[PDB]
Amino acid sequence: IFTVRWLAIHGIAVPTIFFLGAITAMQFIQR
Amino acid sequence: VNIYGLTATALFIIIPTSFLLILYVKTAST
Amino acid sequence: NIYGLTATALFIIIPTSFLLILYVKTASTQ
Amino acid sequence: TIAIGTYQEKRTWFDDADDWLRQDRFVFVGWSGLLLFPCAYFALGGWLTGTTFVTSWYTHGLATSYLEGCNFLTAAVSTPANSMAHSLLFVWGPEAQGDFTRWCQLGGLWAFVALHGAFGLIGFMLRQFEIARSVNLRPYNAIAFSAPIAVFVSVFLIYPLGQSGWFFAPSFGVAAIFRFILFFQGFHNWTLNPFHMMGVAGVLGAALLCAIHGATVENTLFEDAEETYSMVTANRFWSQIFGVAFSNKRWLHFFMLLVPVTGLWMSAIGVVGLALNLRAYDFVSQEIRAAEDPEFETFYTKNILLNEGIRAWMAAQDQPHERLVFPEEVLPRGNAL
Amino acid sequence: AVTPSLKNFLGSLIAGATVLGGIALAITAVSK
Amino acid sequence: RPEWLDGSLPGDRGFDPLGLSKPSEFVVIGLARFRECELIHGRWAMLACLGALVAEATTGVSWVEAGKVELDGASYAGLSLPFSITQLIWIEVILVGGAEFYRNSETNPEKRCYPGGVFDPLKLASEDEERAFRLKTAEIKHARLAMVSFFGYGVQALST
Amino acid sequence: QEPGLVTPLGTLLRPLNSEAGKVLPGWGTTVLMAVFILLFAAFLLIILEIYNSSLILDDVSMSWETLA
Amino acid sequence: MEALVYTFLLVGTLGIIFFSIFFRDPPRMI
Amino acid sequence: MEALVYTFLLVGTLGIIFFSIFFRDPP
Amino acid sequence: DILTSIRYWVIHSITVPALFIAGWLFVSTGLAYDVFGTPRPNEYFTEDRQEAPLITDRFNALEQVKKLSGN
Amino acid sequence: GLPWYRVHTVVINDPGRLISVHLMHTALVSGWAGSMALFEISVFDPSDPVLNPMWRQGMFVLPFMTRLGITQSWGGWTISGETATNPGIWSYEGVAAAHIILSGALFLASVWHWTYWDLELFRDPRTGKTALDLPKIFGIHLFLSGLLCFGFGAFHVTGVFGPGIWVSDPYGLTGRVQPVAPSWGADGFDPYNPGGIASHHIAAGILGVLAGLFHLCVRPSIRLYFGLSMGSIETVLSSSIAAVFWAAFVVAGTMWYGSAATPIELFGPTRYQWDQGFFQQEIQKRVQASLAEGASLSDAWSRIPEKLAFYDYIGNNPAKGGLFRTGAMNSGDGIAVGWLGHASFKDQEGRELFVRRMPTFFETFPVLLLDKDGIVRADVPFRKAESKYSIEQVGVSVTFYGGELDGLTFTDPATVKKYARKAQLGEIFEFDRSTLQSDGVFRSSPRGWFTFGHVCFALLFFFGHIWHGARTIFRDVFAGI
Amino acid sequence: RPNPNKQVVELNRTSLYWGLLLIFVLAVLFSSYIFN
Amino acid sequence: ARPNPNKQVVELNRTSLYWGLLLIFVLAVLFSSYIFN
Ligand code: CLA
Ligand code: CLA
Ligand SMILES: CCCCCCCCCCCCCCCC(=O)OC[C@H](COP(=O)(O)OC[C@@H](O)CO)OC(=O)CCCCCCCCCCCCCCC
Ligand SMILES: CC1=C(/C=C/C(C)=C/C=C/C(C)=C/C=C/C=C(C)/C=C/C=C(C)/C=C/C2=C(C)CCCC2(C)C)C(C)(C)CCC1
Ligand SMILES: CC1=C(/C=C/C(C)=C/C=C/C(C)=C/C=C/C=C(C)/C=C/C=C(C)/C=C/C2=C(C)CCCC2(C)C)C(C)(C)CCC1
C-alpha cells in the first residue's frame, strides 16, 4: 500500500542510501 | 545661542510641568 | 553637542514623566 | 451537507479536500503542507546534492565539494559569481538557458535552495497557525517563530539585495558562515553596532533564563491538577539570593518568550542597516584625537587597525572579481605603525 | 517579437500550471 | 429566453448573459433603477451625438477640439458671447445642480423615469397601451444606438 | 437603548451602511476571484522579471539610458 | 533659534489660557 | 562634560536597581 | 505498528545493495563528473589557462564557460 | 483595567471615535509635512544648483515637492537657478502653509467627531446596534481611490490640466518639469520610462473604478464571509498592514535601485552608477570624441561640464555614509566650490599611470598607480613602511587638464601624493571645509536614509501584520482565556 | 509597622492651570535675560 | 452625546514602572556614546 508515511520514509531514505554509496566510492578514490 | 540657556529653559519648562501633571493625575484619579 | 544633549535630555525626561504619571494614576486606587 | 452557520450548505469538492487534509494521521499534512513539504524537501535535497557533487571552481575559484575532497566543515553551497548581480538565476533563464550542467556550474543551486527554503519557512509558519487553530490554542508559537524568519530574510535576502549581488550573501556551509562572520567583522565593524549588542544581550539572557528556569523547577519539586513544584519556595530563594524574583507563572514564561524574539528582531534591524553600508563604524572624536596625538591609543584604535588588516589581507582572494594585486609594501603591518 | 527569454518564461508558466494541476488532481483523487 | 426577462417593458430583448438584473437569494448574518439609468444615459447620448454632428456640420471645428477655442474666445454658431470660463462653469454647475436636485426628489420610480407633465407638450402619452409603448421602445432603441455611436466616436477620437 | 443622534447628512448616507451581514448562499463568485488572482500573479511576475533583467524584451532597455 | 523659542513660549502660554477658559472644572455649589 | 553625563546615567541606573531591590511592592 | 519481522528484512535485502552498487558505479564510471560538470583532478588547469577561471560576464556565460572548461 | 499597550482598543467598537482618532493622526501627519517643509525652506541655500544641489544639503521633503512641479519660491528664486517671476499660490511656502491649515481643519473635525459619536448612521436599522457593512465601505473607498488615480494620471502627469512631472536626461544634466505623454506598449513597464507613470495611473484608475463598482454592487458569499471574517474589523487592519508593507518594500527597492520616479537630480546618484563606472564611461566617451575631432587634451577636457564630473565622485555615493554620521553631505567633506580638473599621472619614462579607484565597499583603500595593462607601477606605502615602488623612487609627475588647474604640472612628491589620494576617490574637487566645520567623513544621501527607514518600517509592519492576523483569526481564544 | 501619619496630596485642575501659567509666564519673562 | 459605554482606565503597577525606567536608562546608556559621537 502506498500510504503517506511510506512515501515520506522512502523519499527520505532512498537518496540517503544512494548518497552514502557515492560518498564511500569517493572515499575509495585518491582524493 | 548658548547651550546652557536653551537647556535651562527646557528643564524649567518641563520638570515643573511633569510634577504638576503628576499631582493633578493623582487628584483626579482619587 | 547641542543636538545630542537635547535629544538625550528629552529621551530621559519625557518617557519617565509618562511612566510616572501612569504609575501615580495606578497607585491612587490602592 | 455542511453546517456553515445560520444555514446549511451542500458539501463541495473543497469540503472533501479539507476533510482529507485535516484527517488525523502520523504526519499532519494540513493545507499548509502543500507549501511546506515540497519546498523544504527540495531545499534539503539541493543543499545535500550541492555539498556532495557540485563544485565552485568557477563562481569563487574554490573547491567546496566532497567529490573534490572537502570535509563536512569546509563543504558549502557557494553563491553565484558577482557577474550575475541580482539575477534570480532560473534554470530556464537567460544565464543557463536550460542546460543543467552549466546551471550548476554557474551556481544556481544557491538561489534554488534559498528561495525554496524561504517559501518553506513561510509554509512552516502557516503550519503552526493551522495546527494551533485546530487544537484551539493561542498561536504564540507563530509570533515566537517570526524572529527566525526576520533574521533569515534580513541576512540572506535583504543584505545581498542592498549589496552588489548575491555573491556577498552568506553561503550555506560551516566554514562559509565563519568567513561571512569575519567578513562582517572586518568590513563593517559589526561587533560595535548597538543592534548587534542588543541581539547578543537577548540571546545570552535567553540562555540564562533557560538554565535558571530548568534548575529552579527541578530543585523545588514536591515529593510524591496541583503543581509539581513549589512556587513560594523558589520565590523566597531567588528573592533572598539575587534580590528580585518572579511571582507569576504567566509573567515568567512570557518573559522567557519575549527576550530572544526582541533580541533577534533588533539584530535583524541592525543587519538591514548594514545592507546599505550604514555602519556604526567610527567615533569621530576618537579618530581626530588619535590622528593629532600619536601617543593617544585606546582599544578602539586597536580594533580599527585590526579591521584594516583584515580588509587588506582578505580582499585579495575573497573578491576575485576586483582583480586586486596588493604589493607587499602597501599591506598594513604591525611593525610599520 | 518573441525573444528566447519570453518563450522560456512562458514555458515556465506552463510547467508551474502543470505541477499545480498535478497536485490538485492528486488531492481530488485521494479525497474522493 | 431568460426567466427574469419578464417582458412588459420597452427594452425587452433577451440580452443579459451575466445576470445583472437576475434576482438572487440572500442570507442575513431593482430592474426599475437600471432601466432609469439606461434611459438617462441614452438620452444624454443622443443629445451629445446630435450636438456633435451639428457642430461638425455648421462651424466645422472638431468636437474633440471644442473647448480650446472656446477658452481663448467664447463663441456659439459663429457669434461671440461675453462669458469667461469661470462664469460659464459657475452658471453651469448652479443650473445643472438645480435641475438634478429637482430630478431625484421623486418617491415614485415610474414618474422618476417618465415624468411627463410639462415635459410632454403634446398629449402624446394619454392612456394608450400600444402606440405609447411602441414609441417608448423607439426612444429606448434610439438611445442604445446613440450610446454605441458615441462610444465609437470616442474610440475613434483616441489614436487619431 | 434610545435612538442615536439624527442628522440630515447621516440620513443621506444611511442607505449605504444599512446592509450589514448580507451574504450570497454558496460559494458565490469565488471562482472569478481565483481567476483574477492568478492573472495578477502572472502580471506581477512579468513586471518583476522585466525589472530584474531576467526577462529581456526588444523594446524595453532597462537602463538609465532609456531616459533618452 | 531664540525667536523660535520665544514663539513657542508665547504659543504655549496662549494654549494654556485657552484650555483654562474652555476645559475648566465646572463650578458647583458656589 | 561628557564624562559627567556618562557618570550621571550610570549612577541613575544603579539607583534604579537599588530601589527595585529594596523598595519592591509586597505580594 | 512497528514491523521488524523477517519478511521486511528479506524484501529489503535486495534493493538496498542494488542502490549501493548503483551509487558506487555512478561515482566510479565517471558519470558524476559529466553530469555535474565537476572537473577531474587532471583537468583543473588546462594548457591555455594556469589560474582560477573568471566569469566576468552575464549574458555570455554559457559559451564562455564552455570555452574555458577545455571543451 | 487596560494595560499600557491596550489603551487604544477603546474605539474598537465605536465608529465615531475611530473616525476621530484617524482624523487626529491625519492632522498630525499634515502638520509634520508643513513644519518640515517650512524648516527645509528656512535652511535651504539656492545660491549654486550645480555644485550644491538640494540632495547635497540633506533635503528630504524638498525633492518630493519638486518632483511634482513645485519649482518656485516666494523668495525670488527657482530650483533651476533663475529668478522667480509670478510664483503664484503653489510655491514651497504656499504648500507648507496649505498643509498647516489642512492640519488645523482636520484637528477641528477630529474634535467634533470625538464629541458627537452616537450617530444614527452607525446603527443597524434592524437590530439597532452599532455595525459597519465593511464590504460596502470598501467598495466606496475603492471607487474614490480609482477615480482619484485616474484623474491624477490623466490630468496631472500628462500635462493636460496639471503641470507634469520631473523628467531628466540619462546622465542627469538637463532636467525639468514637463508633461509626460502616455506610453502604451511593451515599454512603460520599463521603469526608467516616464510615460509608464501616466499609462499605469490611467489604466489602474479605470480598473479601480470598475472594481469599486463591482464591490459596491455584489455582496460577498457566505463561505468567503465566514472564511475571511468579514464581520470583524481587525481582519481589515491585518490586510491593510499587509498591503502597506508590500508597498513599503516596493518603494524602498525602487528608491535604492533608481527609477524614473526617483530622478538623480533630486535625490542624488546611485551606488550602482559608481560601481559600473557610469559617469566615468560617459566622460571618457565624450573626451575621446573631442580628441578624435582634432582638439588637444586641455580644450577637450575643458568641454566636460562640472556637473558631470561632480557626479563622478565617491562622495556622492549613498553607500559611503554611516549610521551615526548625521546631517547633510556638506557637513561631511565641506561644500564643493570648484573643479580642479582631470589629473594625469606620468612616470619619468613617459608611461601614463592610472590610479585605481576605491571600491564603494572599502572604508580605507591603499592608493595604487597602475600601468596601462594593469601592472602595478607606483604606490604610497603603508605609514612609515619600507618601500620599493614609492612615488619618490619611481618619480611620478602629475599634470592637470581643464577646470581650475589647467596646464599646471607638479613634480614635488608631496603634492603628487596628495593629488593621488584625492584622485583615488574619483574626480578632484575643491572643498570649503570651514563654513560648516565639516568633520571630513562622508555622510549618506537622502536616497540611503529613505531606503533604510522604509525597509525597517516594512519589516516591523510585517511583524504587525502577523500579530494582527493571528489576533483576528483567533478571537475566541484571545477573548481572555 | 504602618505609620499612623499617612496623608495624600491633592491638586485640583485649577491649581494645575495656575502652576502651568506661572511657570510659562516666568519662562517668558526670564528667557530674554537668560539667553542675553 | 451621552456617557460612552466604552470607558476603561489604564493601570501600571510598580514592577512595570521599574521595568520601564530600567529600559529607558539602559537604552540611554547604550546610545549616549554613539549620539555624542
Ligand atoms: C523616514 C523618514 C525620514 C527620513 C528618511 C529622514 C532623513 C533625513 N532627515 Mg529628517 N525627519 C523625520 C523623518 C525622516 N528624516 C521626522 C519624522 C522628523 C521630525 C522629528 C525629522 C526631522 C529632521 C530634522 C530637524 C533634520 C532632519 C535631517 C535629515 C537628514 C539627516 C539624516 C538623519 O536624520 O540623520 C540622523 C539619523 C539617525 C539618528 C538614525 C537613527 C537611528 C536610530 C533609529 C536611533 C534610535 C535612538 C534610540 C531612540 C535611543 C535614543 C537614545 C537617547 C540618548 C536619545 C536626512 C535627509 C537633518 C538635515 O540634514 O536636514 C537639513 C535635519 O536637520 N530631519
Ligand atoms: C496600521 C497600523 C497599526 C494600527 C492601527 C494598530 C493598532 C493597534 N495595535 Mg498594532 N502593531 C502595528 C501597527 C498597527 N497597530 C505594528 C506595525 C506592530 C509591530 C511593531 C504592531 C504590534 C502590536 C502589538 C504587539 C499589539 C498591538 C496592539 C494594537 C492595539 C492597541 C494599540 C496600542 O498598542 O496601544 C497604544 C500604544 C502605546 C501608547 C505605546 C506607544 C509607544 C511607542 C512604541 C513609542 C512611540 C512611537 C512614536 C511616538 C510614533 C511612531 C510613528 C511610526 C509608526 C512612524 C490597536 C488596535 C495591541 C493590542 O490590541 O493587542 C491586544 C498589542 O498588544 N499592535
Ligand atoms: C548579594 C547579591 C546582590 C545582587 C545585586 C544585583 C541585583 C540586581 C537586581 C536587578 C533588578 C532589575 C530591576 C527589576 C525590576 C523588577 O521589579 O522586576 C520584578 C520582577 C517580578 O515581577 P512580578 O512577578 O511581581 O510581576 C507580576 C506581574 O503582574 C507583572 O508586574 O522580577 C523579574 O522580572 C525578574 C527579572 C530580573 C531581571 C534582572 C535584570 C538585571 C539588569 C541589570 C542591569 C545592570 C546595569 C548596570 C549599569 C551600570
Ligand atoms: C537539486 C535537484 C533537484 C532535487 C534534488 C533532490 C531532492 C535531492 C535529494 C537529496 C537527498 C535527500 C540527499 C540525502 C542525503 C543524505 C545524507 C548525505 C545522509 C548522510 C548521513 C550521515 C552523514 C550520517 C551521519 C551519522 C549518523 C546519523 C550515524 C551516527 C553518526 C553520524 C553523525 C556519522 C530538483 C529535482 C528539484 C531539480 C534538479 C536537481
Ligand atoms: C488650529 C489652526 C491653526 C494652527 C494650526 C497649527 C499651527 C498646527 C500645527 C501643527 C504642528 C506643528 C504639528 C506638528 C507635528 C509634529 C509631529 C507629529 C512630529 C512627529 C515626529 C515623529 C513621530 C518622530 C518620531 C521619531 C523620532 C523622534 C526620530 C526618528 C524615529 C521616530 C520615527 C520614532 C490656525 C490658527 C493657524 C488656523 C486654523 C487652524
Q: Is M30 on the interface with D (CB under 8 A)?
A: yes
Q: What is the resolution of this structure in A?
A: 2.9
- The one-character DSSP state at K338 is E
| Single-letter residue type at F151 | F
Q: How many CB atoms lie within 10 A of CB J1?
A: 4
Query: What is the nearest CA distance from D321 to chain E, expressed in angstroms?
Result: 27
H12 CB neighbours in chain B (<8 A) are: 13
C-beta of residue D254 within 8 angstroms of C-beta of residue D209: no
In whole angstroms, give the CA distance from residue G31 to residue K123. Answer: 33
Between CA D257 and CA D264, with CA D261 as vertex, the angle to 5 degrees is 150
In whole angstroms, give the CA distance from residue D162 to residue K29. Answer: 29
Pick the closest to residue D263 from D122, D159, D144 (CA basis): D144
| J27, J36, J54: residue with CB nearest D104 | J36
Q: How far is the CA of B22 from the centre of ligand 2 (A)?
A: 25
Q: Is D194 on the interface with M (CB under 8 A)?
A: yes
Q: At what angle do helices D108-135 and K446-473 cross, to 10 degrees?
A: 30
J39 CB neighbours in chain D (<8 A) are: 55, 57
H helix runs in B1-30, sequence order? 3-29
Q: Which residues pair with K262 in a beta bridge?
A: K259
A12 CB neighbours in chain J (<8 A) are: none
Phi and psi at K176, nearest 5°, equal -165, 175
| M30, M36, M37: residue with CB nearest D194 | M30
Say whether E3 and G56 touch across the interface (CB within 8 A).
yes
E strands present in K124-264 = 165-168, 175-178
Substitution target in D200, D259, D283, D288 with the highest count of M β-carbons within 10 Å is D283
Ligand 1 pocket, residue K327 CB under 6 Å: yes
Instruction: Region of K336 please: left (phi>0), alpha (psi -120 to 50) or beta.
Output: beta
C-beta of residue K340 within 8 angstroms of C-beta of residue K319: no
Q: How many CB atoms lie within 10 A of CB K46?
A: 18
K186 CB neighbours in chain G (<8 A) are: 57-60
Q: Which residues pair with K397 in a beta bridge?
A: K346
Question: What's the N-to-C CA distance of chain K in angstroms?
Answer: 16
> Obtained via which technique?
cryo-EM
Which chains lie within 8 Å of chain B at 3 or more CB pairs, if any? C, H, L
| J27, J32, J44: residue with CB nearest D57 | J44
Mutate-to-test residue for ligand 3 from D244, D254, D255, highest number of ligand atoms within 8 A of CB: D244
3-state SS, residue K409? strand
Q: How many CB atoms lie within 10 A of CB K321?
A: 24
| B7, B21, B26: residue with CB nearest C28 | B26
> What is the sign, positive or negative, of the torsion defined by CA atoms of K257, K262, K263, K268?
negative
- The one-character DSSP state at K148 is H
Q: Is F57 on the interface with G (CB under 8 A)?
A: no
In whole angstroms, give the CA distance from residue K310 to residue K173. Answer: 11
Q: Is G30 on the interface with K (CB under 8 A)?
A: yes
Q: Is M19 on the interface with D (CB under 8 A)?
A: no
3-state SS, residue K187? coil
In whole angstroms, give the CA distance from residue K339 to residue K271. Answer: 22
Residue with cell 542627469: K172
Substitution target in F22, F28, F105 with the highest count of G β-carbons within 10 Å is F28
Say whether L16 and B23 touch across the interface (CB within 8 A).
yes
In whole angstroms, give the CA distance from residue F101 to residue G12. Answer: 13
Say whether D336 and K380 touch across the interface (CB within 8 A).
no
Question: What's the N-to-C CA distance of chain A in angstroms?
Answer: 43
Query: What is the nearest CA distance from K219 to chain F, expressed in angstroms?
Result: 9
Give the HSE-up count for residue K176: Cα atoms under 13 Å, Cβ half-sphere.
8
K126 CB neighbours in chain F (<8 A) are: 28
- Could you please report the per-residue DSSP string of D162-175? HSS-GGGSPPEEHH
Phi and psi at K139, nearest 5°, equal -60, -45
H helix runs in D72-139, sequence order? 100-106, 108-135
Pick the closest to residue F39 from F124, F158, F146 (CA basis): F146
In whole angstroms, give the CA distance from residue G56 to residue G62. Answer: 9
Query: What is the nearest CA distance from D203 to chain K, expressed in angstroms?
Result: 19
Burial K165-175 (b: 16+ CB within 10 A, else e): bbbbeebbeeb
In whole angstroms, give the CA distance from residue E15 to residue E5. Answer: 15
Q: How many CB atoms lie within 10 A of CB K387?
A: 18
Q: Which three cell numbers stand for residue D286?
A: 576618537
Q: Is E24 among the annotated ligand-binding positions?
A: no
Pick the closest to residue D42 from D125, D101, D118 (CA basis): D118
Ligand 5 pocket, residue K456 CB under 6 Å: no
- Cβ neighbors of H25 (< 8 A, separation 6 or more) are L12, L13, L14
Burial K404-428 (b: 16+ CB within 10 A, else e): ebbeeebeebeebbebbebbbbbbb
> What is the sign, positive or negative, of the torsion defined by CA atoms of K154, K158, K162, K164?
positive
Burial class (CB in 10 A: 0-12, 13-18, 19+), D281: buried
C-beta of residue D193 within 8 angstroms of C-beta of residue D270: yes
Which chains lie within 8 Å of chain M at 3 or more CB pairs, if any? C, D, I, K
- Could you please report the per-residue DSSP string of J52-66? ------STTHHHHHH
C-beta of residue K336 within 8 angstroms of C-beta of residue K199: no
Q: Which residues pair with K410 in a beta bridge?
A: K398
Pick the closest to residue K285 from K311, K269, K303, K263 (CA basis): K303
| Single-letter residue type at D276 | L
In whole angstroms, give the CA distance from residue D229 to residue D221. Answer: 4
In whole angstroms, give the CA distance from residue K361 to residue K363. Answer: 7
In whole angstroms, give the CA distance from residue K249 to residue K459. Answer: 9
